[PDB]
Design a protein around this ligand. Structure first.
Ligand SMILES: [Cl-]
Ligand SMILES: [Cl-]
Ligand SMILES: [Cl-]
Ligand SMILES: [Cl-]
Ligand SMILES: [Cl-]
Ligand SMILES: [Cl-]
Ligand code: NA
Ligand code: NA
Ligand code: NA
Ligand code: NA
Lengths: 123, 121, 123, 121
């Protein structure tokens, strides 16, 4: 449901994700990272799949954050792909990819992969 | 860098990506697939990190497509993370993650990973 | 240290990993999976990097399991890449890739990615 | 399928892989890199799933290389997961994970991911 996703979420590293799920499948908000060459909030945009999920199935979604704002420019972007699972303790379990802009020669080492779990606190 | 991302791109599988890069970091457009429980165009939204301009590196970007439109609902979403490189032959080199909505029981096997290279040819 | 890694380990899904770290960087053992089209034990082989790790740094390692034994043949293989962290509660944190043999047309969907954390019980 | 994996392979970067596939699933050989904090040959060990034989699919396999030899110790290890396809032009298509040993503080950024295609050309 859009509502269920809308809110303030935090992950294990201490980063903040503030999101609004819109009626048409859109996700917009800001992300505050606790790691990296990140300073302040960054704009995020994503999409989620408005499932008829009468299976106890999670809702698939994903979003992107380009690490550039008015204070810093890290020349990198991260995409998180995962699913939202609601209940008393709603969680968003994700796997992410962080690509840094590089010269052709270092391209082979341009992408990091990891996983983050988000816990909701506010709507 | 910048502007050059705007246009129509194609991947090795035959999927087409039509994007508009906005001056402040936004990416908007539509994605038409070649594989999957897909059927027609899907909305895509993303972000790119624009700035330097001089020689160097590619431009980092990422975007998402939830596979639900007026025709199909595959209950999944794909995110591509990569970098744009322009020049005589511009390309976007990406690695993607495709997550399907599952029950916890199948959660361990919900995400596929791959890579795609897009060109305007 | 090889010893530290040698032992019986379990992950959150309930699978068993029995390993022996050898002096030359080798890892051999058996793996018992709790999920998949897996039945019984499967042979595993890997390598670890005998670090001078006087940094409180983890030990990098990796191993592979081809899901075929005398009882089942799943036509797939999994590789786990991660690091061993010792202490009172020794853990091996990993990220894995599971590739299934497929026809050329379905190759785009041949690989799954995930993460597993192993807790040691025995040597 | 089977046998055909044995030989010397090369990836787009210029690294060379020399492997022996044993009749019961084992993979042994040496890997010589083109990039990294690498210097010469490194030992590799892996497994492949052999069986069917008739038309179809590729053969699933995987292998690991810890980047430590008598010359260098990069305190990292790489695992490649993929499938072998033979025919007039045989290839091994893989996706890899490279993990470096870090302190917990940098654990979030310890693993790189990529893909490599190896040919005997
Ligand atoms: Cl984060
Ligand atoms: Cl595609
Ligand atoms: Cl699809
Ligand atoms: Cl497992
Ligand atoms: Cl390589
Ligand atoms: Cl390397
Ligand atoms: Na992150
Ligand atoms: Na794709
Ligand atoms: Na697994
Ligand atoms: Na490599």
């Amino acid at each position: 449901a859009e509502a269920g996703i809308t809110g303030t979420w935090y992950n294990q590293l201490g980063s903040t994700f503030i999101v609004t799920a819109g009626a048409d499948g859109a996700l917009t908000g800001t992300y505050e990272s606790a790691v990296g060459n990140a300073e302040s909030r960054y704009v995020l945009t994503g999409r989620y799949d408005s499932a008829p999920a009468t299976d106890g199935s999670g809702t698939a979604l994903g979003w992107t954050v380009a690490w550039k704002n008015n204070y810093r420019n890290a020349h990198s972007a991260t995409t998180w792909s995962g699913q939202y699972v609601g209940g008393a303790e709603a969680r968003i379990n994700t796997q992410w990819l962080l690509t840094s802009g590089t010269t052709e020669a270092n391209a082979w080492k341009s992408t990091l992969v990891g996983h983050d779990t988000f816990t909701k606190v506010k709507p």
